Amino acid sequence: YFGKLESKLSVIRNLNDQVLFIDQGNRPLFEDMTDSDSRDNAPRTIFIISMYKDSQPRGMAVTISVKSEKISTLSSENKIISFKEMNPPDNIKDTKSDIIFFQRSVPGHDNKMQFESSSYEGYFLCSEKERDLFKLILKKEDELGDRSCMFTVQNEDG
Structure with a gap:
């Protein structure tokens, strides 16, 4: 079971120092910081x-x-990324949750973080280039070390 402790306002960046944002279509994307839309995306x-x-510490x-x-x-x-129309809850009774991720440092790089789905073990938040866009996706990572699944x-x- 999970109990909420604190919240922080945060900026998330991928392996290329592109900044995570939510677009108008409610899609999580990454922007170059010279992106012409960076004013409107702010x-x-x-x-x-x-x-x-967490009563079962895993990350x-x-x-x-x-x-x-x-x-x-x-x-x-x-096993896909979406947004639920909910505030983060004060308590979660189960040991797994579609909204809980385990955040862990990368070996030898304490500032680099990975986010694993608590409901689908082995699935991680990753940045993926798709045509001209850079998307936040959920990806099954067999072997760790893929910098595309590491964030600051x-x-x-x-």
Whole structure:
């Protein structure tokens, strides 16, 4: 079971220092910081990362949420990325949750972070180039070390 401990406003960057944002179609994408749309994208680059106490410690249990009038929360339900129309909850009774990810440092690189789905073991948040877009996806990572599934997390107050 999980209990919410604290929340922080955060900026998430991929392996190429592109910044995670939510586009108008509610899709999580990565922008170059010289992107001509970076002015309009700015409010949608701020994420609420909530950290949870976990009765079965497996990594740092977090939810990733966005505020746009209402708060929505990243979900790995059905092994795809989506947003649930929910605030991060105070408590979660089960040991796995489609909105809980395990955040862990990369070996030898304490600043680089990976996010594993707590509901689908072996599935990680990753950045993937798809045509001209860079998308946040959920990907089954057999072997770790893929830098495309490594991020840095910057606190808005830090």
